[PDB]
Design an enzyme around this catalytic site. Sequence first.
Site, PDB file in Angstrom:
ATOM      1  N   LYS A   1      90.207  60.481  35.307  1.00  0.00           N
ATOM      2  CA  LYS A   1      90.056  59.214  36.005  1.00  0.00           C
ATOM      3  C   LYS A   1      90.820  58.112  35.267  1.00  0.00           C
ATOM      4  O   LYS A   1      91.511  57.307  35.908  1.00  0.00           O
ATOM      5  CB  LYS A   1      88.563  58.860  36.107  1.00  0.00           C
ATOM      6  N   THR A   2      90.835  58.072  33.935  1.00  0.00           N
ATOM      7  CA  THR A   2      91.553  56.990  33.278  1.00  0.00           C
ATOM      8  C   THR A   2      93.060  57.182  33.387  1.00  0.00           C
ATOM      9  O   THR A   2      93.799  56.190  33.396  1.00  0.00           O
ATOM     10  CB  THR A   2      91.108  56.930  31.818  1.00  0.00           C
TER      11      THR A   2
ATOM     12  N   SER B   1      80.477  55.022  27.019  1.00  0.00           N
ATOM     13  CA  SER B   1      79.725  55.700  25.989  1.00  0.00           C
ATOM     14  C   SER B   1      80.633  56.812  25.501  1.00  0.00           C
ATOM     15  O   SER B   1      81.462  57.350  26.255  1.00  0.00           O
ATOM     16  CB  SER B   1      78.403  56.245  26.556  1.00  0.00           C
TER      17      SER B   1
ATOM     18  N   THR C   1      82.978  64.281  35.906  1.00  0.00           N
ATOM     19  CA  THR C   1      83.247  63.599  34.636  1.00  0.00           C
ATOM     20  C   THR C   1      84.621  63.848  33.998  1.00  0.00           C
ATOM     21  O   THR C   1      85.210  62.883  33.502  1.00  0.00           O
ATOM     22  CB  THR C   1      82.137  63.971  33.624  1.00  0.00           C
ATOM     23  N   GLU C   2      85.228  65.036  34.018  1.00  0.00           N
ATOM     24  CA  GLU C   2      86.513  65.217  33.351  1.00  0.00           C
ATOM     25  C   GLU C   2      87.561  65.442  34.434  1.00  0.00           C
ATOM     26  O   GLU C   2      88.152  66.522  34.535  1.00  0.00           O
ATOM     27  CB  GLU C   2      86.422  66.431  32.382  1.00  0.00           C
TER      28      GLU C   2
ATOM     29  N   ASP D   1      89.082  55.358  26.389  1.00  0.00           N
ATOM     30  CA  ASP D   1      89.445  55.036  27.776  1.00  0.00           C
ATOM     31  C   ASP D   1      89.636  53.540  27.958  1.00  0.00           C
ATOM     32  O   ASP D   1      90.627  53.086  28.511  1.00  0.00           O
ATOM     33  CB  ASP D   1      88.369  55.509  28.766  1.00  0.00           C
TER      34      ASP D   1
ATOM     35  N   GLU E   1      86.896  50.247  36.246  1.00  0.00           N
ATOM     36  CA  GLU E   1      86.691  51.678  36.105  1.00  0.00           C
ATOM     37  C   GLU E   1      85.214  51.907  35.801  1.00  0.00           C
ATOM     38  O   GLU E   1      84.682  51.293  34.872  1.00  0.00           O
ATOM     39  CB  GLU E   1      87.606  52.229  34.966  1.00  0.00           C
TER      40      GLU E   1
ATOM     41  N   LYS F   1      86.405  47.967  32.083  1.00  0.00           N
ATOM     42  CA  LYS F   1      85.488  49.105  32.063  1.00  0.00           C
ATOM     43  C   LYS F   1      84.176  48.520  31.520  1.00  0.00           C
ATOM     44  O   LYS F   1      83.998  48.424  30.311  1.00  0.00           O
ATOM     45  CB  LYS F   1      86.028  50.246  31.155  1.00  0.00           C
TER      46      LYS F   1
HETATM   47  C1  LIG Z   1      80.171  60.473  28.349  1.00  0.00           C
HETATM   48  C2  LIG Z   1      80.935  60.560  29.663  1.00  0.00           C
HETATM   49  N1  LIG Z   1      82.342  60.732  29.385  1.00  0.00           N
HETATM   50  C3  LIG Z   1      80.744  59.284  30.494  1.00  0.00           C
HETATM   51  C4  LIG Z   1      79.348  59.199  31.108  1.00  0.00           C
HETATM   52  C5  LIG Z   1      78.905  60.367  31.963  1.00  0.00           C
HETATM   53  C6  LIG Z   1      77.543  60.065  32.557  1.00  0.00           C
HETATM   54  C7  LIG Z   1      77.102  61.226  33.443  1.00  0.00           C
HETATM   55  C8  LIG Z   1      75.756  60.995  34.153  1.00  0.00           C
HETATM   56  C9  LIG Z   1      75.438  62.184  35.059  1.00  0.00           C
HETATM   57  O1  LIG Z   1      74.918  63.204  34.600  1.00  0.00           O
HETATM   58  O2  LIG Z   1      75.755  62.123  36.246  1.00  0.00           O
HETATM   59  C10 LIG Z   1      80.925  57.997  29.650  1.00  0.00           C
HETATM   60  C11 LIG Z   1      82.148  57.142  29.964  1.00  0.00           C
HETATM   61  O3  LIG Z   1      82.893  57.524  30.870  1.00  0.00           O
HETATM   62  O4  LIG Z   1      82.354  56.095  29.327  1.00  0.00           O
END
Ligand SMILES: C[C@H](N)[C@@H](CCCCCC(=O)O)CC(=O)O
Lengths: 219, 219
Positions: free
Chosen positions: B15-16, B41, B11-12, B54, B115, B37
């Site tokens: 990517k953007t 959320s 998640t971090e 993003d 994305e 995109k």
């Molecule tokens: C809120 C985050 N940045 C992201 C969503 C993560 C979902 C993870 C699901 C999992 O547990 O695999 C939202 C986003 O990128 O817009």
Amino acid sequence: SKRYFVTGTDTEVGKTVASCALLQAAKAAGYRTAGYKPVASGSEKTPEGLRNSDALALQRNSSLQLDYATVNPYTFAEPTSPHIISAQEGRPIESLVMSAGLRALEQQADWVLVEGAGGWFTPLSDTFTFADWVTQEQLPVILVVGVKLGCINHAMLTAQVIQHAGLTLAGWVANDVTPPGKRHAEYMTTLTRMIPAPLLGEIPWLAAATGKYINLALL
Amino acid sequence: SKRYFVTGTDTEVGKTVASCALLQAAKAAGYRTAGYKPVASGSEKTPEGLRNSDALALQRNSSLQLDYATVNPYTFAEPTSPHIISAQEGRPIESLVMSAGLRALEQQADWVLVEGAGGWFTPLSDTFTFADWVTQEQLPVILVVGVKLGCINHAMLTAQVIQHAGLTLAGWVANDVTPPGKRHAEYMTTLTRMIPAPLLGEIPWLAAATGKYINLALL
Ligand SMILES: C[C@H](N)[C@@H](CCCCCC(=O)O)CC(=O)O
Ligand SMILES: C[C@H](N)[C@@H](CCCCCC(=O)O)CC(=O)O
């Protein structure tokens, strides 16, 4: 002997916490237990050589008294990928030595838990990964999931890759790596729905006697 | 239109940042570009409704002037998995709406970058994941790897799952999420060896004009 391989969804998900909870419940069920961590990196110097703390935890949670080198044959000081430090130091990680070590434990234990290093695909050499040795050994796998945002993706990726290799995913353990958060229950329901293996138990956020959180009757 | 889907190893991983570098290089090559995109959320309230940062970055890095809802049809306030907040709010995430939105962009752009949210397997409903829509659309995939300990395992898991679904892994991008560390070069060599797709470029640790780090001639 019963034999299980333990892997995790990422590097700091508390995989050794779940391995000690598993060893504690198997001991309580009457098994002669042994923990085995064939490869470890990130170790401290002592009068007796390098010692890794995760391997020390496995050693003290085993019901048999075992010597350290029996528990952990390959010990590297630097906390990096084992294939980098193995090449640097000039000490090859041999599949035959890893398998001999497992046999030596089966001489005395009837429930053996094997803990890998890192996640599923950790490289041991330039042509060999931990996944190749587990497949070679045909060990059933227990997946430890650290419950946090991003873990659904990582638990599903690991589960499909193991099944594609023709291995049994024996079950999974949820480790609470943070204090209680807003969507903890919905995350636990989604993970139960999607991982094709029984949930063995959930260990609460603790900043040691954890065997009670594991239901060994599902393994 | 050329179309690419961008996913990340976790998640971090920035990517953007990599999506904006890709959009900047495609613009420099003469393409009429659009960022998309479909689901986001973690959003802020404004006079015009919820806005995700993003998606705002994709909108300002597109060479066409585009309206926000064209760039991001589904916007949720809470930063959790889209299938949890979609169910809570009573707003289904529809595959037909996600695909219509992509078509509407292809009316005006000839290079479109899509994305996703999270990693590969992010759930959109209880029976539908982001991976099902990408497979449905047959998009080629660009993998963004945040370079840190644990990323070899995550880059290999994602690469094998995409290939197993019969999709093309078009290439990968290395994003330096930390300052220069001890084994950066050995990690870059291992990742180049193991990911079956061309390395498109490496973006240095920055705590904005990044198009120069991407070689579009490899896509
Ligand atoms: C809120 C985050 N940045 C992201 C969503 C993560 C979902 C993870 C699901 C999992 O547990 O695999 C939202 C986003 O990128 O817009
Ligand atoms: C030093 C760590 N704790 C761990 C190894 C991580 C390797 C990660 C490889 C990859 O990038 O996937 C060592 C250990 O658990 O003994």
